[PDB]
Each structure stands twice: as C-alpha cells, then as structure tokens.
Design a binder for these strands. Structure first.
Ligand SMILES: [Mg+2]
Ligand SMILES: [Mg+2]
Ligand SMILES: [Mg+2]
Ligand SMILES: [Mg+2]
Ligand SMILES: [Mg+2]
Lengths: 94, 277, 250, 94, 275, 252
DNA sequence: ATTTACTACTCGTTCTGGTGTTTCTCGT
DNA sequence: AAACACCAGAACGAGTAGTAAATTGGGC
C-alpha cells in the first residue's frame, strides 16, 4: 500500500464525487490517500472512464528512482517529458 | 463503472458523525452542518461509520454506504449501539450454513466454545465443563483482570456498573470501558458481515441479535481495547468519549485489529473440525 | 403490519413518529403496529427516529420505489436467532429440505408434486413447466418467442419481483441466502419464493409492454411493477406465504 | 524517505520557485517529491518563511493507517477538521 | 532569511541530461527553455549531477544556483564523455585534503593505498613486493580477460576496446565509453561533496581527474560495464539513452551514491594514519 | 593573462571566443591572452564556448562584479595536480610552514618578523597590531570605535569583497583555498591568509570612509566602492604573483 | 423530498506585461 | 545582459442557482 495523489481539471462532477469516496480532497481537485496497488488501478479505471474532456494526473509512491511514479490522462498545459528514463514535466507556451 | 467495496484490512477503523444532514452531493458522502459547512467523507476507506445524535441521513446516503460495504451505526450515550444498517443481501450461503451447523449440534458447539476460551486466556479449559460452567470461569477471570488493571494504572475501582445512572458523575472509569468495548463491537460487527457470517448466531452468547459479535470481541477485548480505556480514565479528562475513540483506534492500528479479525472467526469455527468453506 | 414511506423527512418532533411532507404537513405515524417500515427514495431519517424505531423493535428497510429494489436493511445479517436457525435446520437436513421444495412446487402450479421425486428431479420438471408457460404466454400476447425486446422486459420484470421478495424475506425475518431449490447464491431463497408467484402477475405484464414495443421498456416495466406491487399489495401477501412454506418443513 | 506533496495558493513567486529546486511541479501549485524527514522539515521552514498571505498544505506518507499526515499554513476555503484524531477537511460557506 | 543548503548526496537522483536550450533562473529555480519556448523546470536539488549536452547556453545566475545546492555541472561530449565541469570553488575540507595529500606525498604510504585499491577491486590481495607500474600491468591483463568473459556471457561480438570514436555499426564500445562516463560523473560529484580532490590520484596520475579514475575503476566492472554489454547485446537505437537509463537502475539498486563516500575513506584508511 | 567579461553571451562564432553585446556588437577574443576568464553577473556561456576553453586549457570562473564574490569556477576540487601537493607540502611540514608565515608577515606590515617566534606566537603579535590598527584608523576618521553598530557593518561587508578577489587569485594561480598556514581547518583558510596582507592597504580604510558619512544601505555602498578599487588598482592582477612569492619563501 | 444533467454567470487564481530596480542576503 | 518586485487585467476554472429530468445500470 502506497501513498496516492490525484489532481483533476475540467472533469465532470461524477468523477469528483467518485474520488471523494476513497480519497481526501485537501484542495479543489486535489485528492490524497493511501491505497493498495490493486485499488490504485481501479481508481484509474474510474478516472479514464468518467473523465473525457478533462485532464487528470495521478502520482503514487514506488520503489523507482524518483521514489514515485505519475501518469496523466487527457491533455493539459503541463506535459510530461522523458529525459533518458527520468520523467519531468514541461510548460507549453500558448 | 460499478461501485465495489475495498478489503476491510485496507480501511480506516471508524468515524463518528454528529449534528448535520447526510447527503450524496454528486456521488459522495457529505455532512452538512447547521452553519452550512460541507465535509466530504471517504466511505470507501472506512470500515465502520458511527452516527451520533443530531444526524439526519438521506435514503441515497444509506444506499451508498451499502455499495461500498460500509457499516452504519446509530449510537447512544457512551457510544452504545442502537441500530445499524447494511446490505441485507451481503452474506455467504456456504458460510451461513457452516456457522449454523456448528451452533445447532451441542457437541460441535462445545468444541467452538473451548477454542474461544483457549484463544482468550491462552490456556485450555478444564475438561468436561459445560458452556454455563465456562461462563462461570469467565466471570472469575474477568473480575481479576479488572482488579489487576486498576492496580497497574491507579484507578479507583468499585465494580462494573453497566447502566449510566449508576455512574458517580466523577466516576469516569465505567464510561470509558463501556465506550471502549462499544468501538470494538462496532468494527467486529462490520467484520463479521464482511466475512459473510451471521452476527446473530452465537456459541457462548445466544438469543441476542449480536451474540456472535460478543463472542468474537470478548476474546481480544481485554487484550487491547479495555486496558486502553483505563489509560484515559487515569488522567480523568473532560471529554472521555473522544479520548477513548482516539485511544481505541490507535490500538487497532498498532495491533492490526482489522487484519487479524477475519482470520480469527474462521480459526474459531475450525475447532468444530467440519470442513471449512 | 407494514408501512410505506416516501418523499419526506422522518423525525420525532415532540414525542411521536412523523413524516414531514414537501408542503410542511405533519403526519403522525404509530411506531406500534409496524413490524417493518419501508423507506422509498426521497426519504431522510433522523437519529431520534431510528432510536425510537429500535426501542419498539421495528425493522427499517431501505427499498426502492414500492419496494422494487432492496438497497439496505436495518439489523443486517438477520436479527432473529430462532428464525435463522429454523431456516438453517430445514436446509441442512435432506428429508426436511425435500418437504419444503414440495410445498413450493404445490403453491406454484396449484397441484401437488408427483410422489417419490427428489429435489433434482423436481428441478427438471420445473424447467420443463416454465419454458412451456413462456410459449403459452407468447401465443396469448402475439409475441415471437425463442427463449430482443421481450427478454429485456422479462429480465427487468423479475428484478422488480426479486425486490419485494427479498423485502418480504427480511420482514419475515429469514435469510435470503439460504435456499432450497436454488443454492449457493447470496439470494437463493429470494429466487425460490419469487418463482412461485412470478407467472401469476409480473411476467404476463412484461409480455404486455414488450408487445407495445416502447422506447424505454426498462422504465415502463419497473413503473408497471410498482403499480402492481402497490395496488395488489404483493409484498403484504408475500410474508404469510413465506411462513407457510417453512411451516411445511415440519 | 517518504512521498511528499505540497499544494500552494496565492504565494509569492519566490516560494513557487524555491519548491521547484527539489520538487516536481506536476500542476499549477502542486508539487510532488520523495524526501527524508529532515529535508521535509526544511521544506516546511521554507514554506512558513516565504509564504505571505498565502495558504499552503503539505502531505507526507507515514505509518498511520490513513497512511499519511498533512499540515496547513495560512487560511483557506478548505480547513482541516479533527474527528476524534482523524483529520478530514470541511468547506466553509459565504 | 532565505538560506539555501544542499541535501545529502545519497538522497538524490543520480543524473540528468540537458540539450538544446538556454538555462535561466526564472524565479529562483533551474529552467530549460527550448527553441520553441517550452519551459522545463529542473530540480537542481534531488540531482547529484547535471550533464550539459551541446546546444545548451547557461546563464551566470544558473551556475550560481547549481553551486549553492551543491549540484555538479558537467559539459559532456560525444557518447557522454567529459569536457568541462563547474562547482563550488572552495567547498573543500582542509583536514580531508591534507589527509589525501599526506597519503600521496609519502612514497611508502602511497603504495599502501594502491594495494588496497587492487584488493577491493578484484576481491583478492595484490602480489607482494610489486610496484605501481607493475600492479598497473597485472590489472590490464585481468581486465582483458574480463572483457572476453563478459562478451561470451552476453553473446556480444568482441574485437577489442576502441577508445576513439574514429575506430568504431558495432554499438559495444560506444556503450562502454558512455557507461563509464556516467560513473565518472557521479564519482566526481561524490568526491567534491565529500571534500576531496579529484586531481590527486594514487594509481592514476597526471590527469585532472586521477582520483576519480582511481575510485571508479574499483567498482566499474562490478555493475556498470556489464550493464553496457546488455545494451549492446540488443543493439538498439539511441545507445546513449538506453545506457543512461540502465545506469540509473544500477546506482539505485546498488545504492552507489550511498556507498561511494565510505569507499574513499576505506581506501585511504590503508595508509594507517588517523583520518 | 586574464579577462573580465560582463553583460553578454559567450560563443565561438568562427573559431574563436566572441562576446555578443546587447547592441548585437561582437567582441572577438584571442585564445592566447586568456589563461583565465572571469564571468561577471549577466553573462551566458554557450556549450561551444566551454568546449573551446577546455581544449586550450582556459579556466572559467563565475564571479560577481570585479571579482567581488566567487560563486563557481571550472576545474573544481583542483586543476593542477602538482600545485595542490606543493602547497600541501609547505603546510604539512612545520619548518616549511613557518617560513611561509614569516613571508606573509613581512609582506603585510613592511618589516621582518621577530626572531625565534613560532606560528602560534606570530599570531599573537598579529592580533595586537590589528586591534591597534583599527583604533588608529578610527581616530583618523570620525568614527566611534569600541571593538570588532554601523561601523562593523561596513568593515564586515568590505572584507567579504576582499575575500572574493583573493579566492579568485588563488584559483587562477592554481592553488587550494582550503589549505592555510595562519588560518587552518576552514575551507577558505588560505584566502584569509593572503587577504590579511593587503586588507589594511586599501579596503579597510575605505570602509571607514563610508561609515563616516553614514549613508543609506551601508552594505551596498561598500561593495560598489570595493568593485571600483579592484578594477582601477588591478588588485586581482597583483595578487597572483604575490601568492606564488609567498609560497616560494617556504622552499628556499 | 432527494439527486443529477446542463448552462452561463460570479468569483477567484494563475499568467502576464507594464512600471522600475538591482548585479546584492555580508562577519574568520 | 540577466533577473526580480510591484500590480490589475486577461484568461481560465471552480462554485452556483436556474432550468429540466429522474426515483433507474438486468436475468438464476
Ligand atoms: Mg472537501
Ligand atoms: Mg512556468
Ligand atoms: Mg462476556
Ligand atoms: Mg519583465
Ligand atoms: Mg438545484
């Protein structure tokens, strides 16, 4: 069981409530929790299914070099970049 | 996108709610206060929810709690359980007949009781003793535990008084024990239902609708829950209920109560030697 | 007896059970004379109301509209030790189990079951009878039957039936998981009772709707079942039927 | 070393850049990282010192059953609530 | 008011490679702006070393920020070779510098350090009464055996070590040279942070990174080089990227950054003089 | 040979070091007369510029204005292997170290050090003279002196500026700032040793001048003054030959 | 009575380009 | 030449009554 963080933008109210069933919404669209691997994947199923024109990024703690991993859904101003395996995030200009 | 409950061991122990209405604002549990403040509650990540006086629950809210498999408990003074609701369908048929078969036959029933006795005190019960007789042994051992715990923490002990009238206002000790065991009965009932067994079918306790809850909880109540109640009463706080609530859960955390609860029932029922499901 | 509550808040304003309407009108409800209270969608129950309901020993069941859907019930995992263990006794023993099945068969077709037949053998007869009944019903309501708007209606119909059946079982105080004909399923007993009165009213109504072939067959069937369950007091007439079945287990 | 999450609002550019020295900014004002106990405490010292009239919430993984702990700086629409030791978050009205 | 202190090196990511863009300090932090104007924040903290590939232009303020957080900046060439480096001008410990210096100045003490390097590398003590040049010769023969052994174990076509890019579609030498370069990167960053001099070497001499080569060569074949053969075995596109990605896993799994500092002190300990 | 570059990008347009100005004017720089390049704030170095600097063996140092403060330099830990051990040998051996200190003392006050004095004993003479020097300058200007308010704030800001060009000289000379003779244990021990030699020659009396007028933002006023001094008097330039002369007395 | 789908509208935060400033956050 | 401090506007997303519709996501 590892820490979980979900950040949503422009997502329909269905998803926001769904995430509020397991995770704690500390800020508007920012959810925090500590779930297992199996559960984390089902939450992502909820994300990819209930979000369509919205963009979501989810980061969880692992045994990778960063100590954590993140994957995104939809398109956003901030796009992740792969720098020889190490993935950061870039800021796109209009 | 169906909504299924998560494993009970992967959940938060318990939450207490008071003075507000419960709605389902866009798919999720919300508590609206008299001042209108909204509080989102993660019902999927909570094994049991305690509803204190002043709460009004909507029909949809009760429905959501059942889907995510969260037990709802309406509680009284010192956390005494009044009512509870949950997915009536939830129960395993193979396991129900298993528990029942073990309880109906007196020989099989006695084997189960002895297992409870052994797991509770750490030693086998004397041979050829009946349930009534083990119940007598139980009481004597319990009185000793109360006395020992009193001596260890420095608590003024006069005896166990169940009804709140008999509490001497400045007594605070009995209120803590009744509030502590109530928390344990809460998560235990939630565990039994999730395990797929009936809370009403008991081996030591019988006739009561939560007899099996009492049977299982009594085994580990003085091992962890009750001694934690004496800690709170020693300091004699203003709000003994809250400190006990906080104290019991911390125990549940360190001892991994939720994780070890489900295997305990099956371990108990195994003594019947009937092939487990 | 039993009571249905819909569209309102349940409180204890000053000593009595009340249902507050959208118009703000108070409706006194006697907590006596109510074995079970069915809470239809749109209801809000106060803590004090639940406390009073517990004092008088009244079962609280959260149902869909007219008890069409079961969502949650009070005292989960049964509350009566004697009735659960009674039901268990009838299912564990093979001799008593067969006696219960025969009563279900007799109440179903209106005639006693053939002698010296086992449960498995009786199950074969039922299946044969059901498919024949479907065919006959197909002829009566000019519907093409092969075994697709007709099945969608039937599947929607029986779901409604499973609702009031489970609600009856809960009100009667028995376990829905312990079944005699159907076994292993968490709602095995629901299927057993529902099959008895399934073709008496519900299914022929499902063929009626599929006959008109509407845009929303699911909703119309559920609503139709609602109308049926209310007017015919199906849930009310189900409970005495249930106890009659287990009584046959002698 | 445990997972770290910092969510900032209405904070001066100094703090936003400072957090970007160690943490990854996945979303606007949302930082993620994996730091030790001391570094985490050093991060908070940067927060309480560099934030002015702004509100910050920081969540890190621990050994509680919730799996994480969070503390807040400044005032926000969403204030944390203590429910018998269990900390959730409420939404204040107007 | 705003102090800026470096974090322990073992708690960092090993390396990052940056190319084709200008480096600024937009509001306190490292940023990489590409020709299309996209901004890429780089945490200079949580990064033991930053590699600057061709096409990068670093601002004065950027080099300053990198030095405060103690991040080594390396300008790299083809196949990740090393050209230049920048870091805190001082940022060195007098007790540790003089310790290393004393061990290098004394002829007897220096040899003791060299023998220790041999033992830690091959797992067995060096032959008695052998000089630095002679131990250096023994080293080479065994390495040549290792190359042959590693090649047959991973099924790689081996013809020999080619250092210059001129002498190599055979992807194996490019991988080895790129792999050890990554190791030289984190090694130099570790030595500087530890407070030692990269220039003062015992086995290697004359090179501005002689001590880096000394330390890196000890554990080079334990993990880094055999990983290069794995990459070359598949003979993939962009050999540089895959090797860097592979090296990251090793530095993590082997906890290289954590074990590097104790290695220096363990080696210098052979001098028998109190550190 | 050294050059200071400010307000511009450093590239290698057409084989050689070029400085592109804000007006877009190019300033061609030859590879010979640049043993070391000092990079003042506002400068951006290209990869190709760094590559060429490495081929010709040119040291790159990121400095503040006029070397007032060092931030980062190329070739970190060391650059010249032989010079690091040279300085080390002089510091480790007590006899050689004593010779170096006497040279520092002589160059600083203008008179030979007292006979039969040790490094520890020489430090005591130094401290007494320094404290006396502070007092004398205080009376010469109109500043109230009580020991090491606005007076100290100016001096401490001055010596920081001085430590900047001193370290820059040490790096350019190829020696270690950490290996000191009078000061020891500190990562900039050698910087303090050299700086004390020329500290009262120009810098400190200028700090008293600033403190005399008692202006707004005294810290800033001192730094800029030091910048002007380092440039006009070429402090950094005359420091490097001074440094090697100091270490020379230790060997003969 | 309770809940959701749906839409501008209000409110609030981020981003930004306009002013102008600095080359800076010290002590051996 | 590079970077930072100041602010109200432009852009954008979250929160909010309004309208409306439902009482609902299968079978044994
Ligand atoms: Mg909230
Ligand atoms: Mg940005
Ligand atoms: Mg008991
Ligand atoms: Mg600007
Ligand atoms: Mg509305």
């Amino acid at each position: 069981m590892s820490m979980l963080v979900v950040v949503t933008e422009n997502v329909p109210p269905r998803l926001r409530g769904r995430l509020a069933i397991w995770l704690l919404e500390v800020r508007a669209g920012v959810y925090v929790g500590d779930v297992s691997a199996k559960i984390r994947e089902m939450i992502w199923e909820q994300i990819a299914g209930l979000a369509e024109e919205g963009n979501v990024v989810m980061a969880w703690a692992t045994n990778t070099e960063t100590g954590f991993e993140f994957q995104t859904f939809g398109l956003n101003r901030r796009t992740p970049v792969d720098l020889d395996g190490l993935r950061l995030v870039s800021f796109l200009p209009v | 996108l169906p909504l299924n409950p998560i494993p009970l061991k992967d959940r938060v122990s318990m939450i207490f709610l008071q003075y507000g209405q419960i709605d389902v604002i866009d798919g999720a549990f919300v508590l609206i206060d008299k001042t209108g403040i909204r509080t989102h509650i993660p019902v999927g990540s909570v094994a049991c929810i305690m509803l204190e006086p002043g709460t009004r629950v909507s029909h949809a809210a009760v429905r959501l709690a059942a889907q995510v498999g969260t037990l709802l408990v309406w509680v009284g003074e010192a956390g005494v359980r009044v009512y509870a609701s949950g997915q009536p369908g939830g129960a395993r048929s193979d396991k129900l007949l298993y528990q029942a078969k073990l309880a109906l036959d007196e020989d099989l029933r006695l084997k189960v009781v002895r297992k409870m006795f052994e797991l509770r005190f750490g030693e086998p019960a004397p041979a050829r003793r009946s349930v009534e007789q083990l119940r007598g042994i139980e009481g004597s051992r319990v009185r000793a535990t109360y006395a020992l715990l009193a001596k260890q923490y420095g608590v003024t002990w006069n005896g166990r008084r169940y009804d709140p009238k008999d509490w001497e206002k400045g007594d605070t000790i009995n209120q803590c024990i009744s509030a502590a065991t109530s928390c344990l009965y809460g998560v235990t009932e939630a565990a039994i239902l999730a395990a797929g067994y009936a809370p009403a079918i008991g081996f030591v306790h019988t006739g009561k609708p939560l007899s099996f809850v009492y049977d299982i909880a009594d085994i580990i109540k003085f091992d962890t829950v009750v001694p934690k109640a004496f800690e709170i009463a020693r300091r004699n706080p203003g709000e003994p209920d809250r400190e006990v609530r906080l104290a019991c859960r911390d125990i549940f955390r360190s001892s991994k109560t939720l994780a070890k609860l489900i295997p305990l029932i099956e371990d108990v029922l195994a003594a019947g030697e009937i092939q487990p499901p």
